[PDB]
Amino acid sequence: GRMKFTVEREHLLKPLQQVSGPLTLPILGNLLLQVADGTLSLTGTDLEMEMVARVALVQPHEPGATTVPARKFFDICRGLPEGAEIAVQLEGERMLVRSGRSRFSLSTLPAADFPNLDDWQSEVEFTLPQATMKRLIEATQFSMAHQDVRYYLNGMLFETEGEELRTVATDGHRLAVCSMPIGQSLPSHSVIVPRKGVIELMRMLDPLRVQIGSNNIRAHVGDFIFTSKLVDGRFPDYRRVLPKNPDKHLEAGCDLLKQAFARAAILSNEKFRGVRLYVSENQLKITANNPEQEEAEEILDVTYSGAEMEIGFNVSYVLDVLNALKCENVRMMLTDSVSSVQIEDAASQSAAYVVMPMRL
């Protein structure tokens, strides 16, 4: 006897949709299906990360394993009618799927050729609410580099320190850092999670147990386990990037400031996206112009009592920060026109953003 199971469509759909994500080589487009001890396990991989789902089998079944094309199998199950029962068995080099008077014969590859992580070794473990992991990632994801030759910047730093978990991302022009308490005393550890691993982790956050290994990270969410390889390299130390004594503090409403930058941006250079800030007593003026010599000017009431200053920014990087802040009022901390600015929620220091200016 070979692998055989019968399952309700709605017990299979969401597990199948999730494992079909991290999928190149032919067997890497397949899911590994394994039936053992009343459980169907489904695994997808791209050789660097892996997603496993477990599904309880409440109908009779026979143990075994195969691999089957992942998107086809998912699309077949999704396309069957609501409430359908799905029967699966192996027939030679094919997997036969039956439901009602529908039949599908899919090509298989042997389970024995499916990749597996063989040297897993855990080094730190903790649990935290899914919403906390999601805040940490959403607070910083947009500042990761994209296809930088400095490979370690294309991912996200995850760091444990004290009772806090921290994420850091930077692309050399801007940096984001966010720290959240998790109520457990943690060893100090820092690892770099690749971009595609961050994306997959987010797909799962719909509590979370995390294990950080020597060369991999693992997340347990309900009946799913996600594993990703870590990135080698020395990630930069955000503590050395934060401005040292940004004495000049400007506070403004986040909505009004964002809306003003967004309007000014319309008439900025399409390639370089530069806008000019002029800070004066309780006032901010934003100006933009382009090669057509069009000009935008916005004047806002703000809270500011420092020296007058003019400073240039890539407006896209500024808007990225304001959109990631979920706050009523924003604090910009300035030093001079050629030094980075620190931006934060006026009422919370959980996250900080550092943006380098452009020369005027």
Binding site: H173, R240, V338
Partner: peptide
Amino acid sequence: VPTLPLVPXG
């Protein structure tokens, strides 16, 4: 277009 003081790379 100066960079943040990333070491190395700026």
